[PDB]
């Protein structure tokens, strides 16, 4: 916890896990009671490293071609080596850039394998309107 | 076979074989008849052991098809 004289108090978090909230107590300052994480890992471990590795396959593609759409490297130098699935799982959604709403649809997938299916989901699409955008700028400069 | 503290009989067995019921004689409790066991065991056996491998990479299969519907 690094603390600035700017008027800034970038703090340094390294998380765990989701949790549900109960209720809302109002402040200010807010208060919020928990409970434990809601990061699971079913049965059938075999399917959930398949799509472990499927999924980092995916990102991995989607990150070395997404040089044009700015996408940095030490976001897939940040993923390798991971002991959890959610550990990777998250890191990949964290360092994917989509909306908030598909964010918090993924954060209430507690299912580990689910997840994974709904960030291939996300990778894919992202992929396929990347490609469009090559496609779009190769006809540009062939039109050049 | 024990009782579960909210009012449930369980009891842990293996179906042992099949049988015909002839007749039903009135009930509560319900009363069945028939044979002790009418199963028919493996004959040219060359074919059953196939027909088990056979089922068994099906089965196996089946299971691989799962990507969100994961099975035991």
């Known amino acids: ?29 807010l208060r919020a009671r928990g409970e434990v994480f809601s990061e699971i890992f079913p049965i059938d471990e075999a399917v959930v490293r398949v799509l472990v590795e499927e999924l980092k396959e995916a990102f991995e593609k989607y990150v070395a071609n997404h040089k044009s759409l700015r996408l ?6 940040a993923v390798k080596g991971t002991s959890d699935p959610a550990m990777l799982a998250d890191t990949i959604a964290y360092h ?26 996300l990778l894919s699409r992202d992929l396929e309107r990347f490609e469009l955008d090559k496609r779009v700028a190769q006809r540009v400069k062939e039109q050049m």
């Not at 008027?7 to 402040?27: F, K």
């Open 72 to 77: 940095d490297r030490y976001q897939l130098e």
């Open 1 to 29: 916890a690094m603390r600035l004289p700017d008027g800034t108090l970038q703090v340094m978090v390294e998380a765990r896990a989701r949790a549900q909230v109960t209720d809302y107590i109002p402040g200010p300052y």
């Open 96 to 121: 994917a850039t989509w909306t908030v709403a598909e964010k918090q649809e993924i954060l209430e997938l507690t299912d580990l394998e689910a997840r994974l299916k709904k960030v291939l989901g």
